[PDB]
Design an enzyme around this catalytic site. Structure first.
Site, PDB file in Angstrom:
ATOM      1  N   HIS B  40       0.809  -1.217   0.000  1.00  0.00           N
ATOM      2  CA  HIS B  40       0.000   0.000   0.000  1.00  0.00           C
ATOM      3  C   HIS B  40       0.844   1.269   0.000  1.00  0.00           C
ATOM      4  CE1 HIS B  40       0.100  -0.303   4.599  1.00  0.00           C
ATOM      5  NE2 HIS B  40       0.283   0.995   4.442  1.00  0.00           N
ATOM      6  N   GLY B 142       3.067   5.679  10.208  1.00  0.00           N
ATOM      7  CA  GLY B 142       4.363   5.504   9.586  1.00  0.00           C
ATOM      8  C   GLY B 142       5.103   4.251   9.990  1.00  0.00           C
ATOM      9  N   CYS B 144       4.271   1.108   9.250  1.00  0.00           N
ATOM     10  CA  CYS B 144       4.125  -0.034   8.362  1.00  0.00           C
ATOM     11  C   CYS B 144       5.461  -0.401   7.746  1.00  0.00           C
ATOM     12  CB  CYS B 144       3.120   0.263   7.259  1.00  0.00           C
ATOM     13  SG  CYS B 144       1.437   0.253   7.878  1.00  0.00           S
TER      14      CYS B 144
HETATM   15  C1  LIG Z   1      -5.856   2.538  11.617  1.00  0.00           C
HETATM   16  C2  LIG Z   1      -6.458   2.941  10.266  1.00  0.00           C
HETATM   17  C3  LIG Z   1      -7.900   3.412  10.496  1.00  0.00           C
HETATM   18  C4  LIG Z   1      -5.652   4.108   9.682  1.00  0.00           C
HETATM   19  C5  LIG Z   1      -6.495   1.770   9.265  1.00  0.00           C
HETATM   20  N1  LIG Z   1      -7.174   0.596   9.816  1.00  0.00           N
HETATM   21  C6  LIG Z   1      -8.157   0.009   9.143  1.00  0.00           C
HETATM   22  O1  LIG Z   1      -8.615   0.454   8.083  1.00  0.00           O
HETATM   23  C7  LIG Z   1      -8.745  -1.256   9.796  1.00  0.00           C
HETATM   24  F1  LIG Z   1      -9.378  -0.963  10.805  1.00  0.00           F
HETATM   25  F2  LIG Z   1      -9.494  -1.861   8.911  1.00  0.00           F
HETATM   26  F3  LIG Z   1      -7.823  -2.066  10.150  1.00  0.00           F
HETATM   27  C8  LIG Z   1      -5.078   1.292   8.907  1.00  0.00           C
HETATM   28  O2  LIG Z   1      -4.350   0.732   9.718  1.00  0.00           O
HETATM   29  N2  LIG Z   1      -4.682   1.537   7.667  1.00  0.00           N
HETATM   30  C9  LIG Z   1      -5.430   2.209   6.590  1.00  0.00           C
HETATM   31  C10 LIG Z   1      -4.645   1.941   5.305  1.00  0.00           C
HETATM   32  C11 LIG Z   1      -3.307   1.304   5.711  1.00  0.00           C
HETATM   33  C12 LIG Z   1      -3.309   1.146   7.242  1.00  0.00           C
HETATM   34  C13 LIG Z   1      -2.367   2.007   7.852  1.00  0.00           C
HETATM   35  O3  LIG Z   1      -2.572   3.218   7.976  1.00  0.00           O
HETATM   36  N3  LIG Z   1      -1.261   1.409   8.351  1.00  0.00           N
HETATM   37  C14 LIG Z   1      -0.197   2.165   9.047  1.00  0.00           C
HETATM   38  C15 LIG Z   1       1.159   1.935   8.335  1.00  0.00           C
HETATM   39  N4  LIG Z   1       2.032   2.935   8.388  1.00  0.00           N
HETATM   40  C16 LIG Z   1      -0.071   1.670  10.511  1.00  0.00           C
HETATM   41  C17 LIG Z   1      -1.270   2.077  11.406  1.00  0.00           C
HETATM   42  C18 LIG Z   1      -1.287   3.588  11.599  1.00  0.00           C
HETATM   43  C19 LIG Z   1      -2.043   3.690  12.922  1.00  0.00           C
HETATM   44  N5  LIG Z   1      -1.530   2.495  13.641  1.00  0.00           N
HETATM   45  C20 LIG Z   1      -1.132   1.600  12.739  1.00  0.00           C
HETATM   46  O4  LIG Z   1      -0.678   0.502  13.057  1.00  0.00           O
HETATM   47  C21 LIG Z   1      -4.329   0.500   4.889  1.00  0.00           C
HETATM   48  C22 LIG Z   1      -5.089  -0.682   5.517  1.00  0.00           C
HETATM   49  C23 LIG Z   1      -3.981   0.263   3.417  1.00  0.00           C
END
Ligand SMILES: CC(C)(C)[C@H](NC(=O)C(F)(F)F)C(=O)N1C[C@H]2[C@@H]([C@H]1C(=O)N[C@H](C=N)C[C@@H]1CCNC1=O)C2(C)C
Ligand SMILES: CC(C)(C)[C@H](NC(=O)C(F)(F)F)C(=O)N1C[C@H]2[C@@H]([C@H]1C(=O)N[C@H](C=N)C[C@@H]1CCNC1=O)C2(C)C
EC number: 3.4.19.12
Lengths: 299, 303
Positions: B40, B142, B144
């Protein structure tokens, strides 16, 4: 919300093995000096009642075997600073980080890199207890393992490991060789003073519980700082200072819970107990997260 | 007195880089001449609500990827998608590459997480894969591309790459082949962790650790069969044991002389009545995030 250590790589590159006679432990290799606990020079009998100046004057440079991985480093000088031996070697450590030696205050936290035979084994977070022990995880051969904090690629070394007390807690020195607490590097039964709980840290952790969605312990009661401190002292908690109240400022502002309101929450917790409930999955009140630790992890 | 201990993180620190597409920046893992990261990274914030990854990747070329080790750019010379991970071939082999393996772990297995931001490691902590295929991690924006790993005799076994946070605050991700643990997808859409259970094999390992340290009041005079225990355990929201679980408890059973099924019967009694007022290893709660290996690891001086 987890107990989180600093990444250990900058310290791993400094760990070596030091042997004198049949005693082996760890050393810290910075530039051209290896720092290690002075009891490496002791036989088993020596440790029961050592006169360290008398023992050290009887040693030569060649009595010290220093190994970095498989490579032996030649000792070309040695001196003693309190309970730490400094071995000058003919080789500089290219992996030496920017570093400082600092002496930490009770209640402050640090990461420990537990090592055996100069090789890293595990990393975990510790707090300097108010009675100057640490609740570590150390086995035979762990001495010379260090504790540290990392701030913008500078490693502040604050602890070197020396001993385990009969209660299972641990004692050691700063990197100038001065013990934390009333202990000595002699193999003889030693007790610590009665420990107390790090109040400012418990409050920071209660804020961590609120940041992460947990609020069952909050109340509408109110307290002054002095009335809170009277109750805290009654329950073997450390006093909370105005400095502590100020350091908790960012956590109160982020959560909208005044520091003294969280004090009233903690007062209720102390007077009523937790009623078998948990806070951040813990059945007891956790006091080894500083306000800075909580901010670093939650923001 | 028994605490969580992470592995030394240095071998993994030397592999962390940052990967940016557009304004989306996350972490990547640099091994030999390949960087692995969550796919992503190619999404805009709006794309993440409903991404077509195959079509989004079609619109990207090598020159759209900014890979940096610190501030130093690594030239991308190829790109491909494997399940939910992107593999970016770069023109420089990482000299800090450790001996390594990619592994897919079971629920109950623990690992160390090196939490990273902008390719810079920030902290290290131990995690267990829950039976519902989430981890109770600590991750911010950040994070991920941060990875989870175990070490065995200088070989790093990578088992987790971080992708997302669920609404209960727990975390989900993939193995290093990009296959999610659990039913989750890398789309910003409503998703939920399922009901979790307690990791029985780890509770048993914890009871063995208590026995090693002389805390053994809960050893009863009974035994059970594995099948009878599994059926009772599930009534208390405990995981059933596998044959592999029985075998990984072998070393602790040998060390203590307490048969696995005798320990199972002791645990059953705790579930049906136990604790009362007493503690085990100073705790009123039964800990389930220490594996049998973790117990042995911390009681020996491994590496
Ligand atoms: C939490 C949020 C509502 C934002 C969302 N969650 C859901 O959509 C769910 F609920 F379905 F899981 C979610 O994690 N993302 C939305 C988007 C990526 C991912 C994301 O931002 N990843 C971050 C990587 N840097 C790590 C996150 C940041 C906060 N704490 C973490 O660990 C993708 C699934 C493609
Ligand atoms: C545990 C014990 C009975 C042995 C003794 N303790 C006390 O005599 C005390 F009670 F005073 F502390 C003790 O630690 N030592 C005795 C001897 C050194 C030190 C020591 O062996 N240090 C080890 C360093 N490699 C780390 C230890 C090993 C077990 N776990 C650890 O952390 C010196 C004080 C000179």
């Amino acid at each position: 919300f987890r107990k989180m250590a600093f990444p250990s790589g900058k310290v791993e590159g400094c760990m070596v093995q030091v042997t004198c006679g049949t005693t082996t432990l760890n050393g810290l290799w910075l530039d051209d000096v290896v720092y290690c606990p002075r009891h490496v020079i002791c036989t088993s009998e020596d440790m029961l009642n050592p006169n360290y100046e008398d023992l050290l004057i009887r040693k030569s440079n060649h009595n010290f075997l220093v190994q970095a991985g498989n490579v032996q480093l030649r000792v070309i000088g040695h001196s003693m600073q309190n309970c730490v031996l400094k071995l000058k070697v003919d080789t500089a450590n290219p992996k030496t980080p920017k570093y400082k030696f600092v002496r930490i205050q009770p209640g402050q936290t640090f990461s420990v890199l537990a090592c055996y035979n100069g090789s890293p084994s595990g990393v975990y977070q510790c707090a300097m207890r108010p009675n100057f022990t640490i609740k570590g995880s150390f086995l035979n051969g762990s001495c010379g393992s260090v504790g540290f904090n990392i701030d913008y690629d500078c490693v502040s070394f604050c602890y070197m490991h020396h001993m385990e007390l009969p209660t299972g807690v641990h004692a050691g020195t700063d990197l100038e060789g001065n013990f934390y607490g009333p202990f000595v590097d002699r193999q003889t039964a030693q007790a610590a003073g009665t420990d107390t709980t790090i109040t400012v840290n418990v409050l920071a952790w209660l804020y961590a519980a609120v940041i992460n969605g947990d609020r069952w312990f909050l109340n509408r009661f109110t307290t002054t700082l002095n009335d809170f401190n009277l109750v805290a002292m009654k329950y073997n908690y450390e006093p909370l200072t105005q400095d502590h109240v100020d350091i908790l400022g960012p956590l109160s502002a982020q959560t909208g819970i005044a520091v003294l309101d969280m004090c009233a929450s903690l007062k209720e917790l102390l007077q009523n107990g937790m009623n078998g409930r948990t806070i951040l999955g813990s059945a007891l009140l956790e006091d080894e997260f500083t306000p800075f630790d909580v901010v670093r992890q939650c923001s």
